[PDB]
Amino acid sequence: DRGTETVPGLGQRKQQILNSGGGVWDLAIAMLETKNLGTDYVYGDGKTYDSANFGIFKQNWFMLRTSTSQFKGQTTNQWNNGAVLNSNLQQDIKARQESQNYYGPDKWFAGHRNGESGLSNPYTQDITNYKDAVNWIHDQLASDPKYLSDDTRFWVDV
Ligand SMILES: OC[C@H]1O[C@@H](O[C@H]2[C@H](O)[C@H](O)[C@H](O[C@H]3[C@H](O)[C@H](O)[C@H](O)O[C@@H]3CO)O[C@@H]2CO)[C@@H](O)[C@@H](O)[C@@H]1O
């Protein structure tokens, strides 16, 4: 199922994302990641090393260290270096955009959703379901410009 819900403060975050280099596409991805477009979920989303998640998109460390200028070349053991993305939105957005530009959208979705294993199996039903969910959210956000600044959240239960 899918739907809408009003989240106070959401329009502020939408506008900060869109004024920090993010596009409507970035907004759709982040809207699926968290309810509040925030970074205050549990540290690393409770995961460690290559599986740890950082930033408003919950990017994993494998992706960050393999495909972003800010962390390129870094090791699995260096995973705590990704925590800076939890309070630097500009670098967070740039990292995701760079990562998608390195891998391309299809493989970026696979690695974002399933890590390094996803890169070798990028068209599973689960990755496709995630891609279809982001696309649906994007199309709802694109359907009225009010959704770029109001407190409306579009959600999908992936
Ligand atoms: O698996 C994708 C992504 O999901 C994040 O969790 C999202 C859920 O995907 C879903 O959108 C969820 O929506 C709630 C919604 O907030 C409302 O309360 C409604 O009544 O019930 C739905 C149940 O789906 O919201 C969460 C974010 O809070 C998150 O788990 C990511 O790690 C994950 O990659």
Side-chain angles (χ1 to χ4, degrees), residues 1-32 34-46 48-93 95-106 108-138 140-157:
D1 251 345
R2 54 202 66 210
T4 44
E5 75 188 325
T6 37
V7 178
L10 201 293
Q12 158 72 27
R13 297 292 296 162
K14 286 172 173 166
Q15 284 300 299
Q16 186 83 266
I17 287 166
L18 294 172
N19 293 342
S20 308
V24 183
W25 174 247
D26 299 288
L27 185 57
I29 299 170
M31 180 162 291
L32 190 54
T34 69
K35 197 182 165 119
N36 60 346
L37 295 175
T39 64
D40 64 350
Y41 49 92
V42 298
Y43 184 82
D45 209 20
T48 66
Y49 295 101
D50 272 5
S51 305
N53 287 1
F54 298 112
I56 58 162
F57 315 105
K58 297 191 154 195
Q59 300 185 75
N60 61 72
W61 180 241
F62 170 77
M63 295 297 273
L64 294 169
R65 76 179 175 81
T66 58
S67 64
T68 67
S69 64
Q70 183 173 350
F71 310 109
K72 67 102 205 169
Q74 297 202 18
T75 71
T76 299
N77 192 71
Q78 282 177 288
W79 66 280
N80 292 109
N81 294 353
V84 300
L85 295 190
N86 290 332
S87 49
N88 194 312
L89 179 56
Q90 184 150 224
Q91 292 173 344
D92 192 9
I93 293 160
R96 202 212 63 75
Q97 299 169 339
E98 288 186 337
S99 187
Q100 193 186 299
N101 239 22
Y102 178 92
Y103 279 116
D106 283 11
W108 177 85
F109 268 114
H112 180 64
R113 177 73 172 173
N114 200 217
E116 179 172 16
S117 307
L119 296 183
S120 323
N121 197 7
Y123 297 107
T124 68
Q125 198 49 53
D126 183 67
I127 292 166
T128 295
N129 282 356
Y130 177 74
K131 191 178 318 159
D132 283 342
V134 176
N135 268 334
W136 183 86
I137 291 170
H138 180 265
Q140 317 314 116
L141 292 167
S143 81
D144 192 304
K146 82 189 177 287
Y147 296 138
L148 301 187
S149 64
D150 78 347
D151 291 352
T152 302
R153 168 178 198 235
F154 295 96
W155 60 265
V156 185
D157 192 307

